[PDB]
């Protein structure tokens, strides 16, 4: 069983931006990385894949072996592109307006995944917690595994130490993962519309209403997700230009300091 988890901030950012995308439902994804031994068994998570949940509902969070096949294919692709030994090592989901701790169903699912390999670890992000009494906001995250109880079945939780490795700059893999969220939302809306059109024998004014609903939904998606994401990327480009200028100034200053000194 795993003894520690290191998460690249590069991927923690993708997880956090995925968690804050929506409060109306719980969202999920998978974590790719490597197993390592040092000083102790550790899991280094490098990148994540965002996933679409079909069944939805409260507390009913599972990933299909189809999603596992897609994720393992992406893992092999990234392992060959990056030369890293990347396998699917974990999973994460969001608990909005809900305590960060796992439910007995979360733990049973973690155990069902450990049946694949006891080296599998779970993550949970507790998002926007509202408390007008304190008038403060809060956001938490935790890592966990499961153990068979002393008594029949009834698995129990166990905590895993998790740290964030300071990845000073953005990897391209995380940008290519973050831009998949708008694509997945648009694809979800499109699949809903396509399944709506299956009963072709339907009222025309009703089809206009459903088209208007589809347009309003994608307008909301662009106003709340794609638009702010694009604004963030432009702001980051401006920040990087200013930072490049400052670092060039500092490089010239240190070059002068070492040339004139000794």
């Amino acid at each position: 069983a795993v003894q520690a988890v290191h998460l690249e901030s590069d991927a923690f950012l993708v997880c956090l931006n995925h968690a804050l995308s929506t409060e109306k439902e719980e969202v999920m994804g998978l974590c790719i990385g490597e197993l390592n031994d040092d000083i102790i068994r550790i899991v280094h998570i490098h990148s994540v894949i965002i996933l679409r949940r079909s069944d939805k509902r409260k507390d009913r969070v599972e990933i299909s072996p189809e999603q596992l096949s897609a994720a393992s294919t992406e893992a092999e692709r990234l392992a060959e592109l990056t030369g890293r030994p990347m396998r699917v090592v974990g999973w994460y989901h969001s608990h909005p307006h809900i305590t960060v701790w796992p439910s007995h169903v979360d733990v049973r699912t973690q155990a069902m995944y450990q049946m694949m390999d006891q080296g599998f670890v779970g993550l949970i992000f507790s998002c926007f917690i509202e408390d007008k009494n304190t008038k403060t906001g809060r956001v938490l995250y935790t890592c966990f595994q499961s153990i068979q109880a002393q008594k029949s079945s009834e698995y129990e939780r166990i905590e895993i130490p998790i740290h964030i490795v300071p990845h000073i700059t953005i990897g391209k893999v995380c940008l290519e993962s973050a831009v998949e969220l708008p694509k997945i939302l648009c694809q979800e809306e499109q699949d809903a519309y396509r399944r709506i059109h299956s009963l072709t024998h339907l009222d025309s004014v009703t089809k206009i209403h459903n088209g208007s609903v589809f347009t309003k939904n994608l307008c909301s998606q662009m106003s709340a997700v794609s638009g702010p994401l694009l604004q963030w990327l432009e702001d980051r480009l401006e920040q990087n230009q200013q930072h490049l200028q400052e670092l060039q100034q500092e490089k010239e200053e240190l070059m002068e300091e070492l040339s004139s000194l000794e």
Binding site: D55, R57, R60, E62
Partner: protein, 48 residues
Amino acid sequence: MEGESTLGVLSGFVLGALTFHHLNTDSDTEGFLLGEMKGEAKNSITDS
């Protein structure tokens, strides 16, 4: 299977028209209802 319900549906205006036809009749009245009956399937999911 044989999980079957039998909801009934009307429009405000049809109930209004029945009420109007009645209020004009100073006695019991009666008639026939024409429309269509359609079965819809919901494949509910239970836990997993």
